[PDB]
Amino acid sequence: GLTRGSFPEGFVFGTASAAYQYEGAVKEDGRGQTIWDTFAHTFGKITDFSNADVAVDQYHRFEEDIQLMADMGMDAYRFSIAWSRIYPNGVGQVNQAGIDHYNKLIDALLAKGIQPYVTLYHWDLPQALEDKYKGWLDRQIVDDFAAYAETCFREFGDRVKHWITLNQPHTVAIQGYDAGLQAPGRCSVLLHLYCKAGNSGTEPYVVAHHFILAHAAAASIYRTKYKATQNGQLGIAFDVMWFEPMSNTTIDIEAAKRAQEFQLGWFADPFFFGDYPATMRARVGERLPRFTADEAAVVKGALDFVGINHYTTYYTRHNNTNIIGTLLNNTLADTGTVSLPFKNGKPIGDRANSIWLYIVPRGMRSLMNYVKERYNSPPVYITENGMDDSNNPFISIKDALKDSKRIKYHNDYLTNLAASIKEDGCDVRGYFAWSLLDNWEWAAGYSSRFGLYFVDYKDNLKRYPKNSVQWFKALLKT
């Protein structure tokens, strides 16, 4: 089967995590409140009434967790820095204890021969910026994020050589500002009554625009002041479902392409070509911001690599609607498509625990080829890929460890990835499994177990290896 030999020399294997989902210690060492602290402590927002105040306590347990990575022979660990641990109020006074913590984490990883791949922003905006100017909705976020990024480059970039500025800006724009299912939970209240404020037709495009500009501002700083002496690289992690046409007809083929342009192209077309996709300009019109000439010049080419967070593939059909007033405008209607994991009464594949996560290994290879062809073969890392078990209190821990479905998922998606590189010529440089440990899965709380290690929430967060731990250890053998 698969071995390191199935991938290019030097191909990087790792696991991925995110600060708010893993760290806990939410009030420790001067940490500022974030929009997710506020959101997880608001009624109705988290399905199982939980929060990540303690999470899996990686803030105190990182050395134990690093040994768990080393036990499998991982090359790398993707983690995020909590902005509010560095600047508790977003800007202003730096929190030395935050710098000190992440230095300890980085040094502990390197002491075990594990390379740090660091995400600057994994959704945990300091609440002080949300309060001051509504965070990503205001242009001020661009300069504030860039200053925060600069502090990280300055403090950590002598050791950190792979930076991911932003995690899934598409997810944040849609879930935070169209559906209102993730922090800050804004949307058109006429579409979804649970939201307090927002506009599903306009706010997602503003937020996305500011993410793109924020990346380019940090990248400009990195390139001008840090990159020559640090010799590192910067990218972004895009959430990308693969889309297949719901029928092999010209109208549904164009629909799947359009759905992809509204998902990945929304962000990637600016970074490679200096403007949004034409289809978005045509359909979103004046609700889609325009780059200035000077902005386009800083935005185009601002990525060193493309991070791809990929789980699943849906079918996409053309959709005709031409009335939502303005009052019901939303991003899905804007696409002119509907995407679903069902065709002619049949699901596209087996499903993991998450209701959205269909197991479709071929989509990994199809997406690698799409990125290669559309964007002229940029370097790509799979910055997130994996699947979840339920959190099932009616079975024993021993039965919860038998994650044969996860093994087959990683086997099949990795086989497809290996082929995209070897047969198709895709420039993929590494792969990061979501996730090292079971953790707090945003609005799903503790109901979803994505970990290679099982976490016993009822026994002081004890970590147990699922079967997939041995499978990865065997894969990564030298």
Ligand SMILES: *[C@H]1O[C@H](CO)[C@@H](O)[C@H](O)[C@H]1O
């Ligand atoms: C990628 O998706 C996983 C699973 O939904 C999530 O936990 C991460 O935060 C995200 O980056």
